[PDB]
């Protein structure tokens, strides 16, 4: 997850993209049905504003 | 390495003494007997011509498609581990036809593209680091030129230019030279103009770092230069190093710099090692020039390290004058601006504010296309540069 | 027709001989030999083959190899400069003297710094003044800096290198990319040149209290890059430039007499200004005729170049919405509310 | 010429014949690393560098005992067979730390710290050289001396001269060094060490 | 997902060999067991008793806790201030104990490219778990902790 | 026979073929070309390839065992299919967005209006915009107004994803990027979607990893090809962001996309014509006033409005109810906006 720094680091933008993969493929131009998602966190507040 | 030229520079007679024709003659001598000992055995034994024959089997041993690679780790001789063009790592075999000294652990290797064995080093471009600060010449400046500044130009003669002209002096007292020299004064002085002053009459490779270059943005690329900056100064024989504005590496704030100030003082950490460490030293000389010498660690400072500290004051009226006549030097007044008057201007000018009224009086006499300064145009060029 | 019968019936047992590889010779070398780095392939020292000189062999260029025995075949079409990379990643519209506008005063003060030094030397010799070296451009964003700063680049037959950063582009000019003082090892080849740097990273209305920030990578770059055009430099013919929105947040250097040998103004344009400023961007649409540009102009106070040519492309905009093909006076006063009245606020 | 040209008469003492004797019977190996040694009598598995994971097991004249999990060593570039044992990979750059050329200056040229000297000298001067004195009675001789004082003080200067008189191998390193780009390799040069 | 060998020129699956684990996560494994008899560490008496009782008997009298119902305490963490005694109770207790001691460390699970970390740390209970019972030392839990 | 020699060179075609890249061409009878294999080779073209359609990079068909060009394919893509209707359309009206017209007019004068009347805007003598940016808040309605246009469009859409751009194969991306243009030209009216453009566009790049040397030409590619465009092919290209101010600079410049068009917030107004809208499908009762609902200081954008809707509604399945009462949405507001206690009266 995270909160896609800006000025991160070189192995950290791409652990952003496959955010953005995760992201787009939840609520993206192609509506997924009859596939229900469960996540859980121990700290709700280092996520992303679009998760 | 070897030097092709200077075979024997022994003019120590420095006349028409005898001595000198002694010498010559022996190797004449020598060469006689040489000629016929080398074609007389050249025929009756035609398996290596030397000049035709040796070089030609070598090439065929190579191979046309000479490969590039770089030499990884030194195995015992004759065998070495050489890393492939792209990722794989070779053991291969080290061919004696290479001079076998130039082999670096890490430098550049030619492996034959079939059966891949060391064939030959090569010598490696130079790094763009080294062109970066690779100083020249200095343009224009002289060191009469100058002007003012009297008591302060003897220090910097006297520690980065008089060990490399006159070893002597330091050479039957037993003392060693100050080791470096650190420039300090208000924002103005002629600080860089004695840095690059030195910088002309000097037979050593110049090397010029201003202080906000030290400071780079990923962790590590910092104290990684300063080592690279003393590499290359070794490397080139005699050579001056100046770092100016020395004050930028802890008086600046940057959000490049990944780490904050915690980095930036490693960068220091790293610095203070370059210039007194358990490592051997050489010859290198450090000249640091700053603007504030009391915003900075006070163990960079360190008698050792930089040992002689030049004060640098704003120019005394007398040298106000001087400072006048020789930017004034090659330009055709109109015999009607007294220098005099505008020695007093301002409670205190730097100097380079000198320079820029005598350059700024210019750009004022050639909107009119006109060759001569008046005083009018320096009276303007005296509020547009000190004022606004 | 007896010989095009033969050359297509060999065709078909040539076309089989493995082709060549394409690479770039990076330095020549002795003995009629190079060496060049293939593509995704490491680098190699090749011989070369005798049609070919070893003279026109030069650096960076591209080149061929038979297939297995490599020697250069070849000196194939020449590769894109470097430099011609970083002003296609970077788009500095291209721009001349005719369309500027209410600048008449400064374009006048930027000849005297940047033309005269370079297309005329010698004559400030004559006077025995150093040449300048830097100019300071500065006032509110959309001013027009630079849009003369390249009109001065582009009359002057000077190379217009940009450096802003921009970490993507910095392969360009400089692999190693460590200190901003490697432009200049291209800057010094490319012949005059004029290396603007830009600024305004969002300035004026963020970072306007403390925490973080702290200086700015366009403000160091000069005192880096001025630091060696003052001095430890023998090309003189590189010359740089800024554009800043406030003189008075410079560094205590950069305002220091004898660094910067200019500093033009740049004013949000006056009446006499903006009505100039809007003619050169209106004739680029079918204007219907007798169109008041002199009330336009007074409807817009405050519109440095920006405000302006948002009147006229929203005036074209405007008369698409009805379905029209003239541009008439009503679309240019219906254009001025949207830009300034209905955005005055925020 | 400005590659490799050697001295010529070198050339021919390198027996070009046997360059050719060495350039055809000598087979070229490829570097690689063990990770297992699948048990039946051989099946060695191997991972060279970018190619892939091969199984090999031997050729002739590599002892078992020869070869141990985790070892660098060099295979055929045919069959991928070992051949022989190559050394542990140390980076380059923890590599260049050894000192090889003893720093100029002895054990007179620092005045005052005589105790100082004496207490450096029990700790990095007496355990390795008269190694058998602690032997004849239980004592593990202190390891680890810390030097502090005020810069200028003469911290560098007992510690070069330290190295000066040792006989043991002395390893340099600066503190600043020891920080690097990527999380992670800070303590590789650590471990390497 | 299984390791399964080829043959060279026309692939097909000849064996099955053994699973594979990272070269660094095998050397965490201690072969030369450490000397330290219980009676070494002086004064902690309490906590060398607690440990025994949580990392070592669970893993003998396996009937103990079985027949009463109580699943075993899972892990044991040693604090306290820089030298008292932590390590000498880990390595002591890798004397007195015949099982796989895998040894960790703390800055060594750290590997710079995404996803090495993990790696090691997968491996590392792994090759625990496909051995015997085995007790798997985490030093220096900082590092990987903050 | 010179028909003869015709017919037997062909078999130099063969099945078996390496789909390679036309570069340049150095001279007749000869060009560079790029293999799939990954290298720049120079190769001999046959005799009878029609020269026209050695365009420029487009697609040649190499010999297997020595390189020489020997056809010249039709344009084809790889990870870029047009979404031919089907089951693959977004099914979305513009009646089905809660009143955004500012911003949806934007949209139409600059993506769909250019596509049909081409012929207008060099009348009046404006210029296209060659590329729209959706910048804003996350969940304001950016990809929906997009899932909009794929709908009631006349013209060809490509939808990419920022991160499909980026994969294993080294090397491989640029081709993919440059399939994408090269498809969108072929039919000529088309909509090319760059979804989450943060993904390949980022200002930092540290060129030692080999993921950012593989993203720098990525990026170098799309910038090459968004330049090619000689004011006579519309190809419009919308790009989508949450972050605009991670995207590099160079990437925002005329002749790229050069049209901002902000997603804010919804304010109290338009906030009003988007619980209309969604709850024009669902049930609803009379006793219920969606006036008092948007009347609230909160700030809430596009999907609390729609999670509102979508837990109100779900609150009646729970007593098992097919109309949502006001006691419903009560529920809902309290459980999906969940105000935080910004605010310390104590400083006003
Ligand atoms: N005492 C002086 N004598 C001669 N020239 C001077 C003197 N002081 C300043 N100048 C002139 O000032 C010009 C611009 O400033 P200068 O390069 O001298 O600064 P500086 O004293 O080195 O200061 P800083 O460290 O702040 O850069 C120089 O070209 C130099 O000729
Ligand atoms: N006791 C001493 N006798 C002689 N010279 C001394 C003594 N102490 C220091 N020096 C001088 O100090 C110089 C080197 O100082 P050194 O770097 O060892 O000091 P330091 O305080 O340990 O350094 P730092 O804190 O900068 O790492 C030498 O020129 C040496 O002659
Ligand atoms: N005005 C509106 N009318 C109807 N639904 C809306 C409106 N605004 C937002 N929504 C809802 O927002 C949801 C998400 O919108 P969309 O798929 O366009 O993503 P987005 O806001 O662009 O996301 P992101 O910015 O994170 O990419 C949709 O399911 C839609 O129902
Ligand atoms: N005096 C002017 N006359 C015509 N156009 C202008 C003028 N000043 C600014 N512009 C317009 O502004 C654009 C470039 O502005 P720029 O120089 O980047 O503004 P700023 O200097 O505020 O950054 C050009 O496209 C140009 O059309
Ligand atoms: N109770 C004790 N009896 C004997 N030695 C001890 C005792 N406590 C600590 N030590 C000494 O401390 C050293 C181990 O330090 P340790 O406690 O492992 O450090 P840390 O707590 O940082 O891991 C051993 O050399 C040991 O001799
Ligand atoms: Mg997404
Ligand atoms: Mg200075
Ligand atoms: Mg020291």
Same mark, same amino acid.
């Given at each position: 997850g995270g909160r896609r720094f800006s000025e991160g680091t070189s192995a950290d933008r791409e652990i952003q993209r496959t955010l953005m993969e995760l992201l787009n493929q939840m609520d993206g131009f192609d509506t997924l049905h009859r596939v229900k998602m469960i996540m859980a966190t121990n700290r709700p507040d280092t996520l992303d504003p679009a998760l | 390495g070897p030097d092709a030229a200077s075979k024997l520079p022994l003019v120590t007679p420095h006349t028409q003494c005898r001595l000198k024709l002694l010498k010559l003659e022996r190797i004449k001598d020598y060469l006689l007997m040489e000629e016929e000992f080398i074609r007389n055995q050249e025929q009756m034994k035609p398996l290596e011509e030397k000049q035709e024959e040796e070089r030609s089997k070598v090439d065929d041993l190579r191979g046309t498609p000479m490969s590039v690679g770089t030499l990884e780790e030194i195995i015992d001789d004759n065998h070495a581990i050489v890393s492939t063009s792209v990722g794989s790592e070779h053991y291969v075999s080290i061919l004696s036809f290479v001079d076998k000294d130039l082999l670096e652990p890490g430098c550049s290797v030619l492996l034959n593209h079939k059966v891949h064995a060391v064939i030959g080093v090569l010598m490696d471009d130079t790094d763009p680091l080294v062109t970066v600060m690779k100083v020249e010449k200095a343009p224009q400046e002289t060191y009469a030129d100058i002007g003012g500044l009297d008591n302060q130009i003897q220090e910097i003669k006297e520690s980065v230019e008089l060990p490399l002209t006159h070893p002597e002096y330091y050479e039957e007292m037993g003392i060693k030279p100050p080791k470096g020299v650190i420039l300090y004064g208000p924002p103005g002085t002629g600080k860089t103009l004695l840095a690059k002053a030195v910088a002309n009459q000097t037979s050593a490779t110049f090397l010029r770092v201003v202080g906000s270059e030290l400071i780079q943005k990923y962790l590590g690329d910092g104290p990684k230069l300063v080592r690279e900056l003393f590499r290359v100064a070794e490397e080139h024989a005699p050579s001056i190093v100046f770092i100016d504005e020395i004050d930028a590496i802890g008086t600046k704030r940057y959000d490049s710099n990944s780490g904050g100030e915690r980095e930036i003082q490693r960068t220091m950490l790293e610095l203070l090692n370059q210039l007194d460490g358990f490592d051997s030293r050489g010859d290198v000389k450090v000249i640091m020039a700053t603007n504030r010498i009391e915003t900075l660690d006070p163990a960079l400072i360190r008698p050792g390290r930089i040992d002689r500290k030049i004060e640098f004051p704003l120019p005394d009226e007398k040298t106000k004058k001087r400072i006048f006549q020789i930017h004034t030097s090659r330009m055709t007044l109109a015999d009607d601006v007294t220098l005099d008057d505008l020695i007093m201007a301002k409670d205190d000018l730097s100097g380079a504010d000198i320079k820029a009224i005598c350059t700024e009086a210019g750009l004022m006499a050639l909107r009119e296309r006109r060759m001569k300064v008046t005083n009018e145009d320096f009276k303007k060029s005296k509020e547009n540069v000190l004022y606004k | 027709l007896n010989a095009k019968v033969r050359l297509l019936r060999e065709e078909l047992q040539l076309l089989q001989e493995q082709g060549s590889y394409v690479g770039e010779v990076v330095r020549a070398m002795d003995k009629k030999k190079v060496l060049v780095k293939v593509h995704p392939e490491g680098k190699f020292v090749v011989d070369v083959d005798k049609n070919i000189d070893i003279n026109d062999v030069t650096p960076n260029c591209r080149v061929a190899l038979r297939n297995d025995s490599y020697t250069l075949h070849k000196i194939l079409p020449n590769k894109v400069d470097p430099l011609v990379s970083l002003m296609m990643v970077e788009k500095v519209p291209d721009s001349t003297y005719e369309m500027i506008g209410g600048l008449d005063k400064q374009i006048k003060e930027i000849k005297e710094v940047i033309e005269l030094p370079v297309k005329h030397p010698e004559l400030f010799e004559a006077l025995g003044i150093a040449q300048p070296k830097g100019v300071l451009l500065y006032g509110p964003p959309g001013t027009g800096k630079t849009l003369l700063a390249? $009109?001065? $680049?582009?009359?002057?037959?000077?190379?217009?290198?940009? @450096?802003?950063?921009?970490?993507? @582009? =910095?392969?360009?000019?400089?692999? %190693? $990319?460590? &200190? @901003?003082?490697?432009?200049? @090892?291209? *800057?010094?080849?490319? *012949?005059?040149?004029?290396?603007? &740097?830009?600024?305004? /990273?969002?300035?004026?209305?963020?970072?306007?209290?403390?925490?973080?920030?702290? /200086?700015?990578?366009? =403000?160091?770059? &000069?005192?880096?890059?001025?630091? =060696?055009? /003052? %001095?430890?430099? $023998?090309?003189?013919?590189?010359?740089?430039?800024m554009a800043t929105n406030r003189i008075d947040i410079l560094d205590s250097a950069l305002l220091r007499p004898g660094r910067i040998d200019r500093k033009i103004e740049f004013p949000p344009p006056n009446e006499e200004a903006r009505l100039d400023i809007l003619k050169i961007h209106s004739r680029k649409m079918n204007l219907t005729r007798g169109i008041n540009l002199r009330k336009i102009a007074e409807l817009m106070p405050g519109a440095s170049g920006a405000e302006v040519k948002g009147v006229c492309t929203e005036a074209g905009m405007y008369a698409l919405r009805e379905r029209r093909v003239h541009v008439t006076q009503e679309d240019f006063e219906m254009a001025v509310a949207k830009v300034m009245q209905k955005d005055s606020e925020k | 010429s400005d590659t490799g040209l050697a001295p010529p008469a070198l050339w021919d003492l390198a027996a070009d014949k046997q360059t050719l004797q060495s350039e055809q019977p000598l087979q070229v190996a490829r570097c690689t690393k063990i990770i297992n040694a699948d048990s039946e009598d051989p099946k060695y598995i191997i991972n060279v560098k970018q190619f892939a994971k091969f199984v090999v097991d031997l050729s002739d004249q590599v002892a078992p005992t020869d070869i141990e999990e985790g070892m660098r060593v060099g295979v055929d570039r045919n069959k991928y067979q070992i051949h022989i044992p190559l050394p542990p990979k140390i980076d380059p750059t923890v590599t260049m730390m050894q000192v090889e050329e003893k720093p100029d200056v002895t054990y007179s040229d620092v005045g005052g710290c005589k105790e100082q000297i004496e207490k450096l000298r029990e700790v990095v001067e007496t355990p390795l050289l008269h190694p058998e004195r602690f032997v004849n009675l239980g004592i593990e001789p202190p390891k680890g001396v810390l030097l502090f004082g005020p810069p200028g003080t003469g911290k560098t200067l007992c510690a070069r001269a330290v190295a000066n008189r040792t006989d043991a191998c002395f390893i340099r390193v600066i503190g600043s060094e020891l920080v690097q780009k990527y999380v992670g390799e800070g303590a590789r040069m650590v471990r390497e060490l | 997902g299984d390791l399964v060998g080829v043959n060279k020129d026309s692939y097909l699956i000849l064996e099955t060999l053994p699973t594979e684990y990272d070269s660094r996560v095998k050397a965490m494994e201690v072969d030369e067991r450490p000397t330290e008899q219980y009676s070494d560490i002086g004064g902690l008496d309490k906590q060398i008793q607690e440990l025994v009782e949580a990392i070592v008997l669970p893993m003998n009298h396996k009937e103990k806790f079985e027949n009463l119902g109580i699943q075993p305490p899972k892990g044991v963490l040693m604090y306290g201030p820089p030298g008292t005694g932590k390590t000498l109770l880990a390595r002591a207790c890798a004397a007195q104990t015949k099982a796989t001691f895998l040894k960790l460390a703390g800055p060594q699970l750290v590997q710079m490219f995404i996803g090495d970390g993990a790696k090691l740390v997968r491996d590392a209970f792994a090759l625990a778990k496909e051995k015997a019972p085995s007790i798997i030392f985490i030093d220096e839990l900082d590092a990987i902790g903050t | 026979e010179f028909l003869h020699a015709q017919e037997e060179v062909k078999r130099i075609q063969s099945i078996p073929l390496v789909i390679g890249q036309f570069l340049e061409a150095v001279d007749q009878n000869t060009a560079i070309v790029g293999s799939t294999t990954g290298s720049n080779y120079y190769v001999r073209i046959l005799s009878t390839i029609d020269r026209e359609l050695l365009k420029p990079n487009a697609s040649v068909a190499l010999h297997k065992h020595s390189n020489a060009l020997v056809d010249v394919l039709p344009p084809e893509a790889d990870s870029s299919i047009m979404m031919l209707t089907s089951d693959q359309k977004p099914d979305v009206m513009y009646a089905d967005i809660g009143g955004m017209d500012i911003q949806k007019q934007e949209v139409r004068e600059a993506v769909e209006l250019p596509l049909t009347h081409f012929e207008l805007y060099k009348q009046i003598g404006i210029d296209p915009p060659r590329g729209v940016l959706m910048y804003g808040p996350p969940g304001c309605g950016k990809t929906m107004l997009a899932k909009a246009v794929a709908h009631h469009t006349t013209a060809a859409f490509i939808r990419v994803v920022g991160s499909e751009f980026v994969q294993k194969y080294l090397g491989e991306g640029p081709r993919m990027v440059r399939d994408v243009f090269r498809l969108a030209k072929e039919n000529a009216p088309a909509i090319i979607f760059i979804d989450e453009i943060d993904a390949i566009a980022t200002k930092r790049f540290d060129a030692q990893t080999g993921a950012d040397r593989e993203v720098q030409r990525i990026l170098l590619e799309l910038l090459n090809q968004m330049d090619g465009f000689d004011q006579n092919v519309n190809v419009k290209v919308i790009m989508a962001t949450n972050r605009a101010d991670t995207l590099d600079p160079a990437l925002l410049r005329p002749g790229r996309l050069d049209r901002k068009i902000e997603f804010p917030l919804p304010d109290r107004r338009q906030k009003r014509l988007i619980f209309s809208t969604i709850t024009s499908k669902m049930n609803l009762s009379e006793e219920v006033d969606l006036e008092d609902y948007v009347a609230r200081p909160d700030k809430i954008s596009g999907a609390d409005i729609n999670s509102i809707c979508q837990e109100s509604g779900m609150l009646a399945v729970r007593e098992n109810r097919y109309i949502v009462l006001a006691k419903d949405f009560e529920k809902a507001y309290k459980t999906v906006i969940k105000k935080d206690e910004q605010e310390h009266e104590f400083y006003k």
């Open positions: - | - | 390249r $009109a001065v $680049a582009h009359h002057t037959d000077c190379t217009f290198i940009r @450096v802003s950063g921009s970490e993507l @582009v =910095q392969k360009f000019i400089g692999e %190693g $990319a460590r &200190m @901003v003082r490697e432009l200049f @090892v291209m *800057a010094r080849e490319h *012949a005059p040149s004029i290396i603007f &740097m830009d600024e305004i /990273d969002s300035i004026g209305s963020s970072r306007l209290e403390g925490g973080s920030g702290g /200086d700015s990578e366009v =403000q160091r770059t &000069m005192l880096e890059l001025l630091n =060696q055009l /003052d %001095g430890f430099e $023998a090309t003189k013919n590189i010359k740089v430039i | - | - | -």
